[PDB]
Amino acid sequence: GRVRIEKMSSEVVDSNPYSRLMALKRMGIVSDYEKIRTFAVAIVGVGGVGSVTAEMLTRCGIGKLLLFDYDKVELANMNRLFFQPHQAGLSKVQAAEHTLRNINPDVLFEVHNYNITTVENFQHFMDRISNGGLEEGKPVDLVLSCVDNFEARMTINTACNELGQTWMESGVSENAVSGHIQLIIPGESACFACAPPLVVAANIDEKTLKREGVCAASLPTTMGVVAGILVQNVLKFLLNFGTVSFYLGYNAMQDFFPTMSMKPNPQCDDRNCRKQQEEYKKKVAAEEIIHEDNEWGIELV
Amino acid sequence: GRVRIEKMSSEVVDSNPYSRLMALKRMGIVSDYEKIRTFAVAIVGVGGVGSVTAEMLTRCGIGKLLLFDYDKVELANMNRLFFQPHQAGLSKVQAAEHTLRNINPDVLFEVHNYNITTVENFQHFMDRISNGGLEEGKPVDLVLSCVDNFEARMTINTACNELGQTWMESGVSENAVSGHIQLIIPGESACFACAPPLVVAANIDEKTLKREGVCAASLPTTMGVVAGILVQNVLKFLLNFGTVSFYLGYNAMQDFFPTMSMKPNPQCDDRNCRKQQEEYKKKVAALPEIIHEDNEWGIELV
Amino acid sequence: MSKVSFKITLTSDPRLPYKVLSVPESTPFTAVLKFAAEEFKVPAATSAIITNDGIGINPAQTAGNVFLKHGSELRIIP
Amino acid sequence: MSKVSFKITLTSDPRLPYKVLSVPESTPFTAVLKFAAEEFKVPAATSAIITNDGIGINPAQTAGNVFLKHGSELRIIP
Ligand SMILES: Nc1ncnc2c1ncn2[C@@H]1O[C@H](COP(=O)(O)OP(=O)(O)OP(=O)(O)O)[C@@H](O)[C@H]1O
Ligand SMILES: Nc1ncnc2c1ncn2[C@@H]1O[C@H](COP(=O)(O)OP(=O)(O)OP(=O)(O)O)[C@@H](O)[C@H]1O
Ligand SMILES: [Mg+2]
Ligand SMILES: [Mg+2]
């Protein structure tokens, strides 16, 4: 079976929501912008980062979004972008789907109001990653992790290592003023298990770190930056332009944005990561400028 | 639905929209977060960057926003954040004020649906910068320029040099993949006239560059990044935390974010800039280890 | 008669590449800015120029006067 | 008994500062990670560690084994 692909127009008129996007051809940045309509992206966590991420992808005209979150909108979330006070009490995925369909009815949505880490849900989650692509039965092009805990990150990690699914992970610090994105191509770059954070490594329940009546700080600025760089990386990856980052940090205090590349641990705790590394190493072993006006005789040494 | 809040509270409950913001005190990032309520910011241009900028400041609980834009929402703007398709045809400032008041009813708004560069409007614009602060008759704490043309930038420049008003300027490139922010403290850092772009310097009417039926490219990603760094700079400036940037660029193609510091031109074309530089140099010449709770393994630092 | 040389660095590229331009001193600096921008493939119209130390330059003056006031080491802000 | 030394660089600071740590070889590397994090004033619990070349390290191993597999030059990712 085929999926139909509709025609995105270049026409520069007030009524064309894709006019300023299709202008990326004319400006020579992206030769085949309309290809965005052919991709499906799964987003786990539609909170601070994930909601803005979903909106940015919706506005770009992504073919399909799959949203996973089990939480509800609260007024305490109103310091972040996207959700509005009248949506308080709704499920994040239902609120998001409604707003996003209004924003761009060309985008397909599939949403799941559940916790991806539990026994009941995990297999459905993996089924949706594998079969929830633009054409049913094909995988999603990318998974984006916008969750706020290591257990959920490890779950996505396990799933993607098993499926050989490329994904990107985002995080924001508890003090609100730093964040990062990372690209995980299982076998090619470090998985989350290759270099676990202290708490995961020391087998400490992350729940034990949470004192009641205290929350993480968050800022709409940091969310916007992190979502922006995440989705920019997504566009660069899917539409093949610019340089894809394997890791990009953000330190708001001093405006430092480090790039890095994390390489797989050959003795990674996740056996599928190890297997993927094996497959990867096997597969590996197998102008002159014109000046229209130069009447003053300037010359380049 | 949200209700007005008189005193900004740290209380970590689901119903407190300031809980995750006030947590910045506890975490020792910003000691006096609540001070945000005491400031007013003027935003010129409520488009791609300006709309998100207004939202971020509204969500933070800024005391007052003044919005200036003369344009209407169009569907062609739907590739960018903030505005929704049903708002097409409304004025950007009216649409924005309505959404933003719903988002945070604590924030005061004053909006102006006019072109700031015209002879009729310019004086009103300056009056509002000077008197449109949180208390009527006091100036705004900051002007943010989120416009898409040099004429409007030069207008804000002229006004701020005259008033001695600190402002920040943002821009995004025509190819959608680069942007920047800049802090202008008249006299202390470069004004827009200190180092004018080619078109301004060559006295070319920028209108002449614009071919009908071609538009600039824009991406919601770039808008989000640029607005995010702009408002981050605003918070750092107003709430005195971290390092304020005088210029911060963004090059999306290669993920390069250059910082710079632009210094005033002593022979700047704008005489008020020159005057401000003079006052500044005068005022300058007249101015006066780690504890580890648990170290049972005897690790030592060389 | 006289020529002046400028070393212009592109501030928007992480490599910070430069171009050295030889300019007849009477050339309006606006034409140098344009030439530099074209060399770096960034839009001429929107580019500005500062000194290596970050001082703003108004390019509506001769190359020669720019050279005398600022030296040869400059940075283009696209 | 025997000690190993690590040079740990903080990747999230533009100055890229480092700390040199002397560690008894039988110390679990998790305790080194913690010590380094505390030194750099970043949260221990959320920090990870990689080699200078970017290889992920699992810190649930002795300092001695980390040293043998990876050398002394490491980078903390807060
Ligand atoms: N196992 C999971 N399955 C699905 N979604 C998850 C899972 N773990 C976390 N998330 C989602 O990640 C989202 C993003 O985190 P974010 O911190 O912005 O929201 P929040 O937790 O509601 O905010 P706050 O931390 O201020 O309470 C949350 O909506 C959360 O429900
Ligand atoms: N002189 C001015 N006075 C008030 N607002 C202005 C002035 N000049 C520009 N602006 C505003 O700056 C805004 C930001 O530009 P942006 O490009 O995002 O919007 P746009 O021009 O409608 O979009 P597009 O360029 O795709 O048509 C516009 O809303 C514009 O009207
Ligand atoms: Mg919640
Ligand atoms: Mg959370």
Ligand SMILES: [Mg+2]
């Ligand atoms: Mg318009």
Ligand SMILES: [Mg+2]
């Ligand atoms: Mg415009």
Ligand SMILES: [Zn+2]
């Ligand atoms: Zn691994």
Ligand SMILES: [Zn+2]
């Ligand atoms: Zn000046």
